[PDB]
Design a protein around this motif. Structure first.
Motif, mmCIF file in Angstrom:
data_model
loop_
_atom_site.group_PDB
_atom_site.id
_atom_site.type_symbol
_atom_site.label_atom_id
_atom_site.label_comp_id
_atom_site.label_asym_id
_atom_site.label_seq_id
_atom_site.Cartn_x
_atom_site.Cartn_y
_atom_site.Cartn_z
ATOM 1 N N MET A 97 24.770 13.470 30.798
ATOM 2 C CA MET A 97 24.948 11.786 29.391
ATOM 3 C C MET A 97 26.492 12.218 28.854
ATOM 4 S SD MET A 97 20.804 10.102 28.495
ATOM 5 C CE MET A 97 19.126 11.801 28.594
ATOM 6 N N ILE A 98 26.007 13.516 27.748
ATOM 7 C CA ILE A 98 27.644 13.105 27.124
ATOM 8 C C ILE A 98 29.155 12.762 27.412
ATOM 9 C CG2 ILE A 98 28.569 15.849 27.556
ATOM 10 C CD1 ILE A 98 27.216 14.206 24.218
ATOM 11 N N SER A 99 28.929 12.902 29.384
ATOM 12 C CA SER A 99 30.271 13.140 29.720
ATOM 13 C C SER A 99 30.995 11.683 28.979
ATOM 14 C CB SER A 99 30.166 12.631 31.277
ATOM 15 O OG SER A 99 29.396 12.015 31.869
ATOM 16 N N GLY A 100 30.397 10.509 30.072
ATOM 17 C CA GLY A 100 30.537 8.715 29.007
ATOM 18 C C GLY A 100 30.955 8.827 27.824
ATOM 19 N N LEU A 101 30.508 8.765 26.852
ATOM 20 C CA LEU A 101 30.671 9.233 24.847
ATOM 21 C C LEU A 101 31.872 10.593 24.767
ATOM 22 C CD1 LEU A 101 26.828 10.120 24.252
ATOM 23 C CD2 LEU A 101 27.966 7.639 23.485
ATOM 24 N N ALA A 102 31.966 11.470 25.806
ATOM 25 C CA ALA A 102 33.024 12.238 25.102
ATOM 26 C C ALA A 102 34.660 11.245 25.532
ATOM 27 C CB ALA A 102 32.629 13.575 26.109
ATOM 28 N N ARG A 103 34.357 10.334 26.762
ATOM 29 C CA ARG A 103 35.097 10.094 27.168
ATOM 30 C C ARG A 103 35.816 8.788 26.367
ATOM 31 N NH1 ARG A 103 36.184 8.102 32.786
ATOM 32 N NH2 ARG A 103 38.300 6.670 32.584
ATOM 33 N N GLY A 104 34.771 7.725 26.048
ATOM 34 C CA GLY A 104 35.060 6.978 24.981
ATOM 35 C C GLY A 104 35.108 7.425 23.378
ATOM 36 N N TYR A 105 34.712 8.304 22.922
ATOM 37 C CA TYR A 105 34.696 8.814 21.911
ATOM 38 C C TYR A 105 34.653 10.492 21.679
ATOM 39 C CZ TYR A 105 31.664 5.592 20.593
ATOM 40 O OH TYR A 105 31.444 4.373 20.821
ATOM 41 N N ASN A 106 35.908 10.910 20.337
ATOM 42 C CA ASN A 106 36.755 11.847 19.494
ATOM 43 C C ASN A 106 36.875 12.664 19.394
ATOM 44 O OD1 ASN A 106 39.267 11.154 18.507
ATOM 45 N ND2 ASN A 106 38.701 10.659 16.473
ATOM 46 N N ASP A 107 35.071 13.482 18.912
ATOM 47 C CA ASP A 107 34.929 14.520 19.063
ATOM 48 C C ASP A 107 34.394 14.741 17.210
ATOM 49 O OD1 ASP A 107 35.612 17.035 20.640
ATOM 50 O OD2 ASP A 107 36.782 17.392 20.230
ATOM 51 N N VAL A 108 35.071 14.049 16.433
ATOM 52 C CA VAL A 108 35.021 14.033 15.059
ATOM 53 C C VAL A 108 33.409 12.540 15.123
ATOM 54 C CG1 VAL A 108 36.761 12.727 14.088
ATOM 55 C CG2 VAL A 108 35.410 14.699 12.454
ATOM 56 N N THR A 109 34.684 11.490 15.775
ATOM 57 C CA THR A 109 33.666 10.829 15.733
ATOM 58 C C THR A 109 32.535 10.215 16.401
ATOM 59 O OG1 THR A 109 35.798 9.461 16.022
ATOM 60 C CG2 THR A 109 34.231 7.766 16.320
ATOM 61 N N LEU A 110 32.335 11.379 17.768
ATOM 62 C CA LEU A 110 31.275 11.367 18.581
ATOM 63 C C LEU A 110 29.957 12.384 17.930
ATOM 64 C CD1 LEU A 110 29.525 10.735 20.875
ATOM 65 C CD2 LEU A 110 30.855 12.320 21.820
ATOM 66 N N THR A 111 31.029 13.503 17.359
ATOM 67 C CA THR A 111 29.677 14.064 16.673
ATOM 68 C C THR A 111 28.748 13.502 14.883
ATOM 69 O OG1 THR A 111 30.744 15.881 16.736
ATOM 70 C CG2 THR A 111 29.367 16.283 14.442
ATOM 71 N N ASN A 112 29.792 12.811 14.085
ATOM 72 C CA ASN A 112 29.348 12.027 13.554
ATOM 73 C C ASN A 112 27.919 10.975 14.054
ATOM 74 O OD1 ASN A 112 30.823 13.074 10.821
ATOM 75 N ND2 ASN A 112 32.116 12.410 12.331
ATOM 76 N N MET A 113 28.502 10.549 14.829
ATOM 77 C CA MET A 113 27.816 8.913 15.342
ATOM 78 C C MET A 113 25.918 9.818 16.059
ATOM 79 S SD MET A 113 29.689 7.099 18.474
ATOM 80 C CE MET A 113 28.688 6.476 19.435
ATOM 81 N N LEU A 114 26.269 10.978 16.312
ATOM 82 C CA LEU A 114 24.718 12.360 17.141
ATOM 83 C C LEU A 114 24.230 12.140 15.589
ATOM 84 C CD1 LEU A 114 26.284 13.811 19.969
ATOM 85 C CD2 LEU A 114 24.895 11.969 20.059
ATOM 86 N N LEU A 115 24.931 13.167 14.424
ATOM 87 C CA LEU A 115 24.335 13.348 12.993
ATOM 88 C C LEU A 115 23.383 12.602 12.999
ATOM 89 C CD1 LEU A 115 27.245 15.596 11.642
ATOM 90 C CD2 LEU A 115 24.872 16.011 12.487
#
Length: 597
Positions: free
Chosen positions: A426-444
């Motif tokens: 599932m994370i492959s989509g989110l990684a594809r669209g989000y930064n890494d910093v952006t993806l982590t904060n979103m998850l947090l």
């Protein structure tokens, strides 16, 4: 009331029957003279003075045409003839008045207008003079074999073909006239066939030009269609179709809107449906494209009610008919048509979402959704491609409960269930669209919300695995997560604990060398900064343990790089009280003589 013999003496005198008619008070009898006692006696008297029934009748009629117009006397013989006891009377008089009409050389058409049958409109089939008129016609056709006529033709001469059809449609609904009404709609067709009238002719003849676009509703449009059918069966080698003859008055760009509109209206639905079925076939034969077919059907104007547009199912089946056996991507598929109209699938996907809430649009919804999945699969979209297609990189904080999320996850299921080796998470989509910093904060941030917590936590772990698979040097991830910008409070930073988890995972798979945390810290912030930070974080529950092991590590690193107790002392004085710094120095030099040695 003359009494028996009195007339006998007026019959032995050969008195004119005119004077007897006047003396028997038959002047003011008017039209209800059909019979009024008396008349049988006066007839008896005219037969008395005459020597043959014909001449007796002829004299009576000479008395009568003085008083009554040919119409009114014809009607009186009509109503008169019906009654018993007026039957062989008015047959002798109708006989007589007709051979006068032929003497006067008056045509059946003349008589048609003398009666007023050209005026009677729809009720014509009920006029009491219709049958009288056809008697005079029958006789006139016997005596003028050169120049005959028929009811239908005479009727056409005055009312016109449109008007004659209108009258027959009208006279078919009431049930006394219905039988004759049908017989003559047939004779109308027969007459047209006999003149070699084509469908082109009958179109205008029925004035379907007039009323324009409203023409399928016109009731002579069904007359024109049946006529095409009859002409087809009488001319098997120039057979044509209603649609064929329509496309001479309308090209596709206006004909198809007309049909689309008519198909909605229930009273014209069958007619519209029939024509639409031929249109599709024509298009299929010419391989007219589903993009052209989408616009012709007005689907490009449906906006967001696309899936409740009654031509959608049509257009879908047209599209699948054309592309079946044309298989080898010279196809034109439903998703390509969607893409010519929308710049990403989300608008269709949203429509699907809305449509599957309402129970009567759950079929079409599932149908459209499948086209989406078909098109995604065929152009070889991995699920992160679908994520982009679905525009999920533009929802931000909200992604995990945007309704398109399910779409993406369903695809990811339907994909992996069909693709074993390189299956994706599932994370492959989110990684594809989000930064890494952006993806982590979103998850947090999704971990705070109880509704999204479980999933957020699953995604956190899968993200760790996705950074492993990508072979990400922890140090560079530390950069990407913006952890370099300050050392202050770093062990309370939740991002940092995410990076700590990734570190332990990256070391747990044993590589050339361990990635050491204290190394990354020292690199980013330098010796004293890190030492001071650690002194602070130890005097502080909840970071105490990790700070203790990182302090240990820092000393070990220093020992290893052979940093002297003088230099370490100098550092430590910058970050604690002299009692704490002297103590940690004790530890350090202890652990430095154990090594050099």
């Amino acid at each position: 009331k003359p009494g028996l013999k009195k007339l006998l003496k007026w019959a032995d005198a050969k008195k004119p029957p005119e004077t007897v008619f006047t003396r028997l008070r038959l002047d003011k009898t008017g039209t209800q003279l059909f019979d009024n006692t008396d008349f049988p006696v006066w007839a008896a008297y005219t037969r008395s003075v005459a020597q043959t029934d014909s001449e007796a009748s002829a004299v009576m009629l000479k008395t009568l045409v003085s008083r009554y117009s040919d119409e009114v006397l014809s009607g009186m013989i009509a109503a008169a003839k019906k009654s018993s006891k007026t039957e062989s009377i008015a047959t002798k008089l109708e006989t007589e008045q007709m051979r006068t009409w032929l003497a006067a050389k008056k045509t059946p058409d003349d008589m048609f207008l003398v009666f007023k049958l050209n005026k009677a409109g729809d009720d014509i089939l009920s006029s009491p003079l219709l049958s009288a008129w056809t008697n005079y016609m029958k006789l006139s056709n016997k005596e003028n074999p050169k120049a005959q006529t028929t009811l239908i033709a005479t009727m056409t001469k005055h009312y016109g073909d449109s008007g004659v059809s209108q009258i027959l449609a009208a006279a078919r609904k009431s049930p006394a006239t219905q039988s004759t009404a049908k017989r003559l709609e047939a004779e109308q067709v027969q007459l047209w066939l006999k003149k070699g009238r084509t469908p082109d002719d009958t179109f205008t003849l029925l004035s379907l030009d007039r009323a324009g676009d409203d023409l399928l509703a016109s009731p002579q449009f069904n007359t024109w269609m049946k006529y095409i059918n009859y002409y087809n069966k009488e001319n098997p080698d120039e057979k044509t179709t209603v649609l064929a003859k329509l496309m001479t008055h309308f090209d596709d760009e206006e004909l198809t809107p007309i049909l689309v509109v008519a198909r909605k209206v229930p009273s014209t639905e069958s007619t519209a449906a029939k024509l639409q079925a031929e249109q599709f076939k024509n298009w299929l034969s010419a391989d007219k494209s589903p993009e052209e077919a989408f616009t012709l059907l007005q689907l490009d104007k449906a906006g967001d009610d696309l899936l409740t547009n009654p031509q959608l199912t049509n257009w879908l089946k047209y599209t699948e008919n054309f592309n079946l056996n044309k298989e080898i991507n010279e196809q034109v598929t439903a998703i390509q048509v969607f893409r010519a109209q929308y710049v990403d699938d989300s608008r269709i996907a949203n429509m699907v979402i809305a449509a599957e809430k309402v129970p009567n649009t759950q079929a079409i919804a599932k149908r459209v959704e499948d086209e989406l999945f078909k098109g995604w699969t065929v152009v070889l979209n991995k699920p992160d491609d679908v994520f982009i297609n679905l525009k999920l990189e533009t929802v931000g904080e909200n992604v995990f409960e945007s309704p398109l999320w399910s779409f993406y996850t369903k695809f990811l299921e339907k994909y992996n269930t069909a693709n074993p080796g390189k299956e994706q998470t599932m994370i492959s989509g989110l990684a594809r669209g989000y930064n890494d910093v952006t993806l982590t904060n979103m998850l947090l941030k999704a971990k705070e919300a109880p509704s999204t917590k479980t999933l957020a936590t699953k995604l956190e772990d899968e993200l760790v695995q996705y950074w492993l698979a990508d072979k990400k040097l922890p140090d560079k991830l530390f950069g990407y997560l913006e952890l370099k910008e300050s050392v202050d409070g770093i062990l309370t930073n939740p991002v940092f604990n995410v990076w700590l988890k990734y570190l332990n995972a990256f070391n747990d798979k044993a590589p050339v060398k361990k990635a050491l945390m204290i190394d990354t810290l020292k690199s980013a912030f330098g010796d004293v900064a890190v030492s001071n930070m650690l002194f602070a974080a130890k005097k502080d529950p909840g970071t105490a343990k990790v700070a203790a092991t990182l302090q240990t590590a820092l000393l070990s690193k220093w020992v290893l790089e052979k940093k002297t107790p003088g230099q370490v002392s100098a550092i430590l004085k910058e970050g604690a009280g002299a009692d704490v710094s002297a103590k940690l120095l004790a530890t350090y030099s202890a652990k430095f003589k154990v090594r050099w040695g």
